[PDB]
Amino acid sequence: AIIKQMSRYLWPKDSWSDKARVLLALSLLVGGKVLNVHVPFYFREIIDRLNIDVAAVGGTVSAVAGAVIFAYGASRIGAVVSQELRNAVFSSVAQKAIRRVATQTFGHLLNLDLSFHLSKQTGGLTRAIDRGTKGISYLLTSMVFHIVPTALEIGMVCGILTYQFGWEFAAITAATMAAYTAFTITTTAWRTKFRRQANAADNAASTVAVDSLINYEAVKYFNNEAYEIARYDKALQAYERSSIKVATSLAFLNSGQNIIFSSALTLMMWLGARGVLAGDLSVGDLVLINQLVFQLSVPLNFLGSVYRELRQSLLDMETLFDLQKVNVTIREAPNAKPLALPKGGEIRFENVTFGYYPDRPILRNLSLTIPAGKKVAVVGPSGCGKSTLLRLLFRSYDPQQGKIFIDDQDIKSVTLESLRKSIGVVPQDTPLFNDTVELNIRYGNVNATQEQVIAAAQKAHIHEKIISWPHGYQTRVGERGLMISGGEKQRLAVSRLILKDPPLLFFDEATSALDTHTEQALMANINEVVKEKKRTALFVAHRLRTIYDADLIIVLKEGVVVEQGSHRELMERDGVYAEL
Amino acid sequence: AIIKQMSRYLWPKDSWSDKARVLLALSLLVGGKVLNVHVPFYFREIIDRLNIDVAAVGGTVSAVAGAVIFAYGASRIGAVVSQELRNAVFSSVAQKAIRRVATQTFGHLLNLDLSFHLSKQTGGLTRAIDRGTKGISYLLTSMVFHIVPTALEIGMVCGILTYQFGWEFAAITAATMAAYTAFTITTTAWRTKFRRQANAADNAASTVAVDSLINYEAVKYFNNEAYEIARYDKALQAYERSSIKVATSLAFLNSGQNIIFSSALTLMMWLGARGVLAGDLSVGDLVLINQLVFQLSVPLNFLGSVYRELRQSLLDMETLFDLQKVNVTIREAPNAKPLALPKGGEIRFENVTFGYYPDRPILRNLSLTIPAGKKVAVVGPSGCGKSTLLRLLFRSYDPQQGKIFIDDQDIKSVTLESLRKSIGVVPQDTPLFNDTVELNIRYGNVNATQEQVIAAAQKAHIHEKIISWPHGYQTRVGERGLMISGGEKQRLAVSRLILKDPPLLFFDEATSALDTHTEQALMANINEVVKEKKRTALFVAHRLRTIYDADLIIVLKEGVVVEQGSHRELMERDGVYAEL
C-alpha cells in the first residue's frame, strides 16, 4: 500500500554513505544475476569448444577450452559471492533504517502526554515497536534478498532464451514460474491447517500426560492406571494421525513442485533436441537451456513463507506508523517565553475545574494561592483529588476551564520544558529503574558528577545505607535487583530532588509507607532540605498529623477550597490521630 | 552409543506391518538414489545421441533421442517422488515407534511408587517424555531422511566416477564432501556465538525500551527524555553491531561452501576436458561428471543443524530411557493370593515404626486394631502423623519394621491390586481432573453406566447442585473449568467412593474445608453412607468435635497408641471446642 513507500522512500535514503550502500547493494544484486546467467554460457562454451575432431585439431586443455573452464568456475564463485555480499550490505542498510525508525518512534512515545500512557497496556507499546521493526526487517529483507533477485533473474532468463532460441522457450519458462509459484502458494496455504492441527493434538496429548501425572494419588486410589494409559494412547494416536497428514502434505508439496519443474526441463529438452536436429542449435545449447531454467529453480525456497508473512509484516508496519501518527493533546503555546524563575515563586489558582472523563469533575471551581517563598500543605480525605494537583500543575493534564498562574503568567503560555524544569516532584510510588543506585540518584541531574551524588545522598541520609549494601553504590536495585523497603525508595526520590535543585517543590504523599517512625524521619529530613534556601514547598498528605507543623494549611473538601489556617484551628476536622 | 541400538532395534522391529513399512522405506531410499544417479546418465545419453551429423543421419526426435529424453524426465520425477514417499513412510514408522515408547514409559511412571512422584518436580516428567520423544523423532528423522541417503549417494557417485572415469574423480568427490562437511560443521559451530549475542543484544534493547516506558512519569518529572532516547539508541547500536556479525558470518558460510564446491566442479571439468581431448571420454561425459557432483550438492542443507542436535537428542533419549530404568521400591510378593474380601474386614497393626527419611520415625512402635464391621476413628494434634496411615495401609509406603494384618494375613503378601481394590479413599485435598463432572464422578468405577453415576451423585446429595450448573453434569470443572468450593470437591470424592463400593473405607480429613455447617452436612451424609451396609469405616480428623459420634475412638499421641474409648471420656484432652 502506501506503507511501503512510507518506509522505503524515507529511511533508506537519508545521507550519502547510506545511499552509497544502497547503490552498492543494487549493483551487487545486478552483478550477481549477470554472473549467474553467465554460468551456463561458459559451460556450453566448454561443451562446444571440446566438441571438435579430437585426433586432428585437439591439442591440449588451456589452449582449447581453458579460458572458459576458468570463467565457468569464476562466474559460479562470483555469482554466489555477490549474493552473499549483497545480503550483508543490505542487512547493514536495513538495520540502520530500523534503528532510526525505532528511535524516532520511541522519542515520539516519550513526547506524548500522560493520558496516552495511562490508556495503553504498558509493555504493549514495546511489543508494537518490536513487531513493527521486525515487520520492516522482513519486508526489506524479503524484498531485496528474495523477490527482486528472483524476478530479475526470471526476466533475464526469459530475455536470453528469447534472444537466442525463440519466444517459446520464454513462454515455457514464464509458465513454469507462474505454475510453480501458484502451486507453492496454494498448497502452502493448504498445509498450515495440518501443521496447526498437529500442534494442537500434540498439546492435547501432553496435557493428558500432565493431567494424569498431577493426579497420581487419585490414579492409584481408584486403580485407574490402565484407563489413563488408554487415554494417553488415544491422545497420542490422534496426534500421529495429524502428523501423518503433515508429512504426507509436505511430500505432496515437494513432489508437485519438482513434477512441475521437471516437466518444464523435459519439454525444453524436447524443443532443444528438435532444434539440434534442424541444424539451428548445438548440443551445448541444450545444456544452456537446461542449466538456465534449473538455476531459476534454486532460490525459490522463500515462496512458502512469503505470502502470509508480508501480510503480517504490513500489518505490523501499519501499527508502528500508526503509533507515529498519534498527536499530543497538550499544545505548547507559540512564542512561549521561559519566565518567572528569578521571581519569588508563587502559584495562583483561579476558578479551575478538572476531571478525568470531564462529565464528572474532580476539582469543582477551585481557587487557591500558594504564597511566595513559603511552605504550604493541602490535605483532604483519601480520594478528594489532592493527588490530581501535580498533574494539573506539572501540566501533564490540562484544565478544562480556568487558568493557572506561576508569578503572574499562565502555565499555558510558558515554554513547557522550562515549566517542567522549574517543578520538582517526589511522587507517591517512586519507581526504581532496573539499574544501579548511582543511576537512580543521578537521574535528578544526569550531568552531575560523582561527589555531587555523594553529597546528595548525604543530604538525604542514605550514605550509610548504601555503603551498608554489598556492592556499595553500584548495587543492582529495582525489580530484578536488591529489593528494598518503600521508605528507602522515597528517600532516593528525595535525593533526586536535591540533585535537580528546582525552584518549586512538591512532596505528593512523600511519606506514605508502613512504619510511622520512618515517615517521621522522612518528614524531618525533608524539613531541613526545605528550610533556609527559599524553596516554595508544597505538600500533600492524607495524614494531617504528619504535616501538622506546616507554615500554611489549605484544606480541600470535594473539589473546593473551604478554609485555611494552622495546626490546632484546623485539627478540629475528622480523621483525628486519636485512634493512632 | 548403546542408546541408538536400544531404540532402533526394538521399537521399529515389532510386528509384520511395521517391518514391512520399514522395508518399504529402505527400498524407496535405495530406489530414489538409483534414479537420482540415473538422471545425469540419461542427460549425457541425450547429449551423445544428438551429437551426430545433423544433415546426414539425424532424422527426427523420438527416433534419435526421445526415449532418453523421457527417461531423463521420468528419472528426475521418480527420484524426487521416491524421496517424498520415503519420508512419508518413515515418518509413519517413527511416529508409531514414538507412540509405543511414550505409552510404555508413561505406564511405567504410573507404575512407580509414591516416593518417586514426591521426589520429582511435577510437570518435569512430562517434559522428559516430550523431549525424549522429540529426540527419538529427530534421530530417526535425520538418520533416514538426511544422513543415510546422503552417505549412500556419496558412495554411489564415487563408485560410478571410479568405474567410468578413474579413481581421481572419486578422490576429488570424496575430498569435496569431506571439506564441505568440515567447513559447514566448523563455521556453523562458529556462527552460534554471533546468533546468541545478537539475541542477547536485541533483548537488552527491548528491555531498555520497556524499562523507560514503565517509568514514564519519572522520565517526564526529571526532564530525561533525551537521555532515555540516547540510552535506547545506544542499545540499538549495540544490537545492530551484532546483527552485522550474524549476516556477515552467514555470508562467509554460504560463499565458502560454494567456493569449495565450485572449485570441485571446475577441477573435474578440467580433468574431464583432459579426458575428452585424449579420446577417452566424450562431451556428454563432462555433463555426467558435472551433474553427478552437483546433485551431491543439493541435499546438504541438513549439515548446519545436525551436529549439535543429534547430541541434544541423544541426551534427551538418555533421560527418557533412564526414566524407563527406574525400579519400584515396593515389591509385590511372589505367588500372592487375593484374600479376606469375604471375611469381616478387620485391620490389625503390630509394632510398626514408620518414618519418611527413616532416621526420624513418625510412628513409634505403634499397634492398633480396627474391629470388623465397625466405625473407628483415629485423632491427634495437627502433625502427629494420622495422615500417614493411608499411605502405610494403602501400601504406597512400606513399614520399616513391623507387620500389617487385614483379617489375619499380611498386606505384604496379598496381591497389591486386590489390596488397592479393597481400600476406599476420601483424601484430604481431592484433586479434580480438567474434564467433566461426569468423569470426575465416574472415576470411581469407569465401567459403571450413566444412571449409576446419577444414583451415586444422588446418594451424596449433589444432584441438585450439578443440575444447578449451566451445562448440567457435562460441566467443564477443574483448574481450567468452573471453579468450585472445597466442600463440593469433597462431596465429589464421596460420590466416587460410592461408585467404587469397596469393603474398607477411609475418610482421611474428609471434612476440612472452611464453613462448619458444610462439614456437618458432609459428616451427616457420610454417616448415612457408612451405616447399614457393614462398611468397616476408618476416620481421621484433627477436629474431634466433628467425629464425636464415632463407635470407637483411638488416639495417637506422638506415634503411640495411648487410650481408647468414647466421646465424653476422651473429650478430656486439650484442643477442646470451647473456643469454637
Numbering used by the authors:
A (entry chain A), B (entry chain B): 95 to 674
Paper text:
Previous studies suggest mitochondrial ABCB7-type exporters are involved in maturation of cytosolic iron-sulfur proteins. Here, we report a series of cryo-electron microscopy structures of a eukaryotic homolog of human ABCB7, CtAtm1, determined at average resolutions ranging from 2.8 to 3.2 Å, complemented by functional characterization and molecular docking in silico. We propose that CtAtm1 accepts delivery from glutathione-complexed iron-sulfur clusters. As anticipated, the architecture of CtAtm1 harbors the classical ABC-fold, packing into a homodimer with six transmembrane segments (TM1–TM6) in each monomer.
Next, we determined a single particle cryo-EM structure at an average resolution of 3.0 Å, CtAtm1inw-opn, exploiting wild-type protein without supplementation of cargo but in the presence of ATP. The computed maps display well-resolved TM-domains, while the resolution of the NBDs is somewhat lower, and hence we are unable to confirm the absence of nucleotide binding. Nevertheless, de novo building of almost the entire structure was possible (580 modeled amino acids), with the exception of the first 94 residues in the N-terminus that includes the signal sequence for mitochondrial localization, and the last 26 residues of the C-terminus, likely related to flexibility of both termini. Thus, the configuration is distinct from the available structure of eukaryotic ScAtm1 and hABCB7 (PDB-ID 4MYC27, 7PSL28 and 7VGF26, RMSD 4.2, 3.8, and 3.2 Å), in which the NBDs interact via C-terminal extended helices in the S. cerevisiae structures. As such, our structure is more open, exposing a large cavity (>7000 Å3 as calculated using the software CastP3.0 with a 2.5 Å radius probe) that spans more than half of the membrane into the TM-domain. The cleft is decorated throughout with electropositive amino acids and is partially blocked at several levels: (1) at the matrix-membrane interface through the Asn395 pair of TM6 (one per monomer, conserved among eukaryotic Atm1), establishing an “inner” gate (the first from the mitochondrial matrix), and additional residue pairs closer toward the mitochondrial intermembrane space that firmly links the TM6 pairs. Notably, these amino acids also divide the cavity from Asn395 into two separate, symmetrically related, parts. We propose the inward-open configuration represents the resting state of eukaryotic Atm1 proteins, in which the protein exposes a highly electropositive cleft to the inside of the mitochondrial matrix, as detected in the CtAtm1inw-opn (and E603QCtAtm1inw-opn) structure.
